[PDB]
Amino acid sequence: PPTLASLQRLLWVRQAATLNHIDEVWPSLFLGDAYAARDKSKLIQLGITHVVNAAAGKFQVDTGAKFYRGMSLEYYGIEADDNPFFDLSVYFLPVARYIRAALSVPQGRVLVHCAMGVSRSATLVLAFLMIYENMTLVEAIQTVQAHRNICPNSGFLRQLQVLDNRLGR
């Protein structure tokens, strides 16, 4: 049973010098930023079939279904703030399920992005791994963090612990 400090330490202890716009963090599963989000072309390259906008909203990364018009891809918008007091966890299961049914598609290649792809979307990716890849939070992080610097905020971490916990039992 880890403490917060241990996770944050971990989140610190393993971080490369730079951060890219997108990153395959798991087979057919990408963590990206809003730049990569609107990078229609690389999207094409990568063969993304599903975009998870965890920074969705007119007041945030307002890409929506319309931005991808003509493009052969499906969209999920989650109107979340990167605030410790924002309950991302209410999105934890449904998104795990969304991402799951996608990757279950042969072509299934999912992008999960927020603004900078390190916290809000990072977190939703974590939960998915714990929930559907049989991982734990630390394992999730070590796995994910092998390809992309991440750092869910304290409250998102606290959110994950709880999830780790429900799953422990």
Domain boundaries, the chain: 1-169
Long-range CB contact pairs, 68-73, < 8 A, 24+: 68/40, 71/40, 71/43, 71/44, 73/43, 73/48, 73/49
Q: Residues with Cβ < 8 Å from 161, sequence gap 6 or more? A: 2, 4, 7, 137
Q: Which CATH superfamily is domain 1-169 in?
A: Protein tyrosine phosphatase superfamily (3.90.190.10)
Structure solved using which method? X-ray
Closest to 55 in 3D by CA, of 76, 30, 26: 76
Angle at 168 between CA 120 and CA 139, to 5 degrees: 50
Is residue 71 within 8 A of residue 40, CB to CB? The reply is yes
Query: Cα dist. 131→49, 50, 56, 102, 134 in Å?
Result: 21, 19, 23, 15, 6
Rounded-to-integer distance, Cα 135 and Cα 96, Å: 13
Q: Which residues are catalytic?
A: 114
Rounded-to-integer distance, Cα 105 and Cα 108, Å: 4
Strand partners, 31: 23, 112
